[PDB]
C-alpha cells in the first residue's frame, strides 16, 4: 500500500477504538529486518506446486504480493479449520521461528 504511516491508515476517517491484518505487517517488518532476504507466477506457482501447503508458504507469497485462493488453496484452508489455523500458526511458534521459516521459503525461490 504505502511505506509509511503518517496521517494514519485512513486519513480524516472516523475509526472505532481481522487482527490478522496487523500481524501480517508485523511479520513483514521482521522479514524486512532480515536484509539479505514475469518471474511472479514462475516463483509463485513454484511455491505451491509440490502440493504440500503450509501456512508459512501463504505468508511467503504475500511478501511477493504486498511487496488463486479459491482455485488451489481453499480446500486446504477449510481442512485447516479456516483462518483459525493461520492465527494459531503465529501462536504455537516463535515470532523469530515463523519469520526465519518464511524467509527460508523465499530464499529457495
Amino acid at each position, epitope marked *: *500500500d*504505502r*511505506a*509509511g504511516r*503518517m*496521517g*494514519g491508515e485512513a*486519513p*480524516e*476517517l472516523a*475509526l472505532d477504538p481481522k487482527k490478522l491484518s496487523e500481524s501480517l505487517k508485523r511479520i513483514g517488518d521482521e522479514l524486512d529486518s532480515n536484509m539479505e532476504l514475469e518471474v511472479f507466477f514462475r516463483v509463485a506457482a513454484d511455491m505451491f506446486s509440490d502440493g504440500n501447503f503450509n501456512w508459512g508458504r501463504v505468508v511467503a507469497l504475500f511478501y511477493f504480493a504486498s511487496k488463486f485462493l479459491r482455485e488451489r488453496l481453499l480446500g486446504w484452508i477449510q481442512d485447516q479449520g479456516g483462518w483459525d489455523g493461520l492465527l494459531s500458526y503465529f501462536g504455537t511458534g516463535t515470532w523469530q521461528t515463523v519469520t526465519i521459516f518464511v524467509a527460508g521459503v523465499l530464499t529457495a525461490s
Partner: antibody, heavy 118, light 107 residues
Framework: QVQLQQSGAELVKPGSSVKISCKAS????????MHWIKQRPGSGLEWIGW????????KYNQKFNGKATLTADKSSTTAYMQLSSLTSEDSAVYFC???????????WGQGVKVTVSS | DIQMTQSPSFLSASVGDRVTINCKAS??????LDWYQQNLGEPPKLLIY???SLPTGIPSRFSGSGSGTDFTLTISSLQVEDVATYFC????????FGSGTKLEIKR
C-alpha cells in the same frame, strides 16, 4: 547523507500551472513515502499530500484535491508536484519532505518560492 | 480535520532559561505529535517526534511530553541558536500543524 534537492519555476502568471521537482539522493528512493508541504503567511504550514514511489500511490489533503498532482519516477529518483490554475493565494514556499522509518519528517528539500503575478 | 492550538504565539526568554511551548489537539492523536524548529530561509528541522523521541544529532536539552490531547515541548536551558519559530504537527489522522511560536531573546 540523504539530500532532497528541489527545483521549479518561481514566477508564474495567474491561471497557468507550474511543476516542482524534488530530486532525492543518498537512499533507496522506493522505500520511503514523500510528502509535500506548503508554507505561506496567514495560512501557515499545510500538508498537501504524499506519494509512495514504490507503487505511485498517492493521498491528498482534501483542500488540495485537484490543485496538486503528485508523481514519482523511480529511474531519476525524483518526485514531482504539479500545481494547476494558479491564483495569488498559491504564492507560497513548497517543500518536499521524506517520511522516515520509525521516524517522521527528518529530511527536507530546501523549498521553492512560487510567486503568482501579472 | 484535527485542529491544533499552539501557545503562546510569541515567547521572550534569556540564555539559560527553561522554556516550554504548549500544543492542544481538538481530539486525541495518541503519541503521533512532532515538534519542528525553523530559521528564516530554511526548511523546518525535526526536534522531537512521537511526543518525546529525540532524532539523532538533536541536543538533549530538548524534550517533549504529552497525554494524547495536551502536549509540551521543553528546552531545559535556552541557547542562542534556539532562537527561531517552533511548530507542532499531529499525524495521527491526516496532518495538521500548529500556527507557530516565535521565540525571541530578551534584553
Amino acid at each position: 547523507q540523504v539530500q532532497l534537492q528541489q527545483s521549479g519555476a518561481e514566477l508564474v502568471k495567474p491561471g497557468s500551472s507550474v511543476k516542482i521537482s524534488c530530486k532525492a539522493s543518498g537512499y533507496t528512493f522506493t522505500n520511503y513515502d514523500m510528502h509535500w508541504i506548503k508554507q505561506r503567511p496567514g495560512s501557515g504550514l499545510e500538508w498537501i499530500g504524499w506519494i509512495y514511489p514504490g507503487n505511485g500511490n498517492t493521498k491528498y489533503n482534501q483542500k488540495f484535491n485537484g490543485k496538486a498532482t503528485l508523481t514519482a519516477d523511480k529511474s531519476s529518483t525524483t518526485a514531482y508536484m504539479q500545481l494547476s490554475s494558479l491564483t495569488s493565494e498559491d504564492s507560497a514556499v513548497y517543500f518536499c519532505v521524506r517520511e522516515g522509518l520509525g521516524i517522521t519528517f527528518e529530511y527536507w528539500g530546501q523549498g521553492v518560492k512560487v510567486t503568482v503575478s501579472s | 480535520d484535527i485542529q491544533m492550538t499552539q501557545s503562546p504565539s510569541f515567547l521572550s526568554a534569556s540564555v539559560g532559561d527553561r522554556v516550554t511551548i504548549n500544543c492542544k489537539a481538538s481530539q486525541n492523536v495518541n503519541k503521533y505529535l512532532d515538534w519542528y524548529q525553523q530559521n528564516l530561509g530554511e526548511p523546518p528541522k525535526l526536534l522531537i517526534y512521537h511526543t518525546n523521541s529525540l532524532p539523532t544529532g538533536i541536543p538533549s536539552r530538548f524534550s517533549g511530553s504529552g497525554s494524547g490531547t495536551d502536549f509540551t515541548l521543553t528546552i531545559s536551558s535556552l541557547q542562542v541558536e534556539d532562537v527561531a519559530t517552533y511548530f507542532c504537527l499531529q499525524h495521527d489522522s491526516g496532518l495538521t500543524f500548529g500556527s507557530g511560536t516565535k521565540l525571541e531573546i530578551k534584553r
